[PDB]
């Protein structure tokens, strides 16, 4: 579960902000939030590697708490 | 500078290779053993608070580059004088000094 997939985001959101968003729940050890080079903008889906299982199990619940720019965010195991 | 003002000159850190009449060799005594650089720092160098503050030429008012000089290089060359005291070191009646 150490990693989660996160959908439905707005490009003003940032990886550093994202790390602080999910570390509100529990620390994101490895952050991945693609920067698309071609048009220089984000599609808004994320992958998160944690310390161990602990971060992963919480992950799905952490999704409900999240609400970026008046919108929700998908979090599921991976 | 003139001959009495040469004690006011600064020295180069490395010793001169022509040893005679040098001011910065060990034998001359101007390069002293166990020098503390912090104690001899303000000697013959600019010090805005100290005694040698940033001066300008008395004639042209442009800034000199040597501590304790009252005349800038060009004005001292043209009038024939020592840059520090203003005593004349050259008789320039027959010399059309050319700044070029």
């Amino acid at each position: 579960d150490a990693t989660v997939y996160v959908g439905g985001l707005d490009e003003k959101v940032s990886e550093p902000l994202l790390w602080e968003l999910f570390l509100q729940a529990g620390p994101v050890v490895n952050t991945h939030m693609p920067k698309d080079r071609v048009t220089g903008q984000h599609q808004g889906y994320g992958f998160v590697e944690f310390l161990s299982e602990e971060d992963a199990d919480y992950a799905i619940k952490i999704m409900n708490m999240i609400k970026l720019y008046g919108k929700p965010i998908r979090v599921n195991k991976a | 500078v003139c001959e009495k003002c040469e004690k006011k000159l600064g020295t180069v850190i490395t010793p001169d290779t022509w040893k005679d009449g040098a001011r910065n060799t060990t034998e001359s005594g101007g390069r002293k053993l166990n020098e503390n650089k912090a104690l001899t720092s303000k000697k013959a160098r600019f010090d805005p608070y100290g005694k040698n503050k940033f001066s300008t030429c008395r004639i042209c008012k442009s800034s000199v580059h040597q501590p304790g000089s009252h005349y800038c290089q060009g004005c001292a060359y043209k009038k024939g004088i020592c840059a520090m005291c203003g005593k004349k070191v050259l008789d320039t009646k027959n010399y059309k000094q050319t700044s070029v």
Binding site: - | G10, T11, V12, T17, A38, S41, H65, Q73
Partner: protein, 237 residues
């Protein structure tokens, strides 16, 4: 010139001239000369930059020399580093006034990919280290030790002796205790490679400061048949 005395008389003359027409006209000429290919020209130009820097105080020639480090040419960048090395050697104790200025330049050079950039920066650290001895500049020097120290596993001899010179300068400026704290973990490391390099740093600290290390050794516990605790220091009055 081939004869060295001609070259050192020439360098001196640059400082005397800069006292008359000012350090900037002289310094621009000398900085332009660093693009030359042959090393004898460039090393002497480097010494002359330091000569003028010392005779006309370093706040005059510092800004332009530090600006020249951004020029995208290798010899110019090695050249500026080389003349800072001579400069700190020349000004001595007076170099506590500019150590904060040139600390970020040196930590940029010590992170550099070129090995030479690292050996000249280590020479600058050696000479700057011994000048500020006794003056409370140990935070800059300890910061620069964090950059100098990973270069101990270099194998090229010129770079390897510049690093060792830097560490021997740092021992007398930030103390034997810090230098022992750096060595400690690798003196008994499994690889001979890490071990003998570490042991030859330890020997240099030991030779130079054998007496001061008495207070700084760690506590080794007793094993089954040998006792290793220094019990006298553990005494309480």
């Amino acid at each position: 010139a081939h004869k060295k005395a001609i070259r050192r008389a020439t360098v001196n003359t640059f400082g005397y001239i800069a006292k008359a027409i000012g350090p900037h006209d002289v310094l621009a000429t000398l900085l332009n000369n660093l693009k030359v290919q042959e090393r004898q020209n460039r090393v002497c130009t480097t010494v002359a930059i330091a000569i003028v820097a010392e005779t006309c105080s370093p706040f005059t020639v510092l800004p332009a020399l530090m600006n020249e480090y951004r020029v995208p040419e290798l010899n110019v960048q090695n050249g500026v580093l080389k003349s800072l090395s001579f400069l700190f050697e020349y000004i001595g104790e007076m170099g506590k006034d500019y150590i904060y200025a040139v600390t970020p330049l040196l930590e940029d050079a010590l992170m550099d990919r070129d090995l030479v950039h690292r050996q000249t920066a280590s020479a600058v650290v050696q000479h700057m280290s011994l000048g500020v001895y006794g003056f409370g500049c140990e935070d800059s020097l300890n910061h620069l030790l964090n950059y100098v120290w990973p270069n101990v596993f270099e194998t090229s001899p010129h770079v390897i002796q510049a690093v060792m010179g830097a560490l021997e300068g740092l021992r007398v400026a930030i103390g034997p205790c810090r230098m022992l704290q750096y060595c400690l973990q690798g003196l008994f490391h499994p690889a001979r490679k890490v071990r003998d390099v570490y042991w030859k740093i330890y020997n240099s600290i030991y030779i130079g400061s054998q007496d001061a290390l008495i207070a700084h050794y760690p506590r080794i516990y007793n094993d089954d048949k040998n006792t290793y605790i220094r019990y006298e220091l553990d005494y309480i009055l």
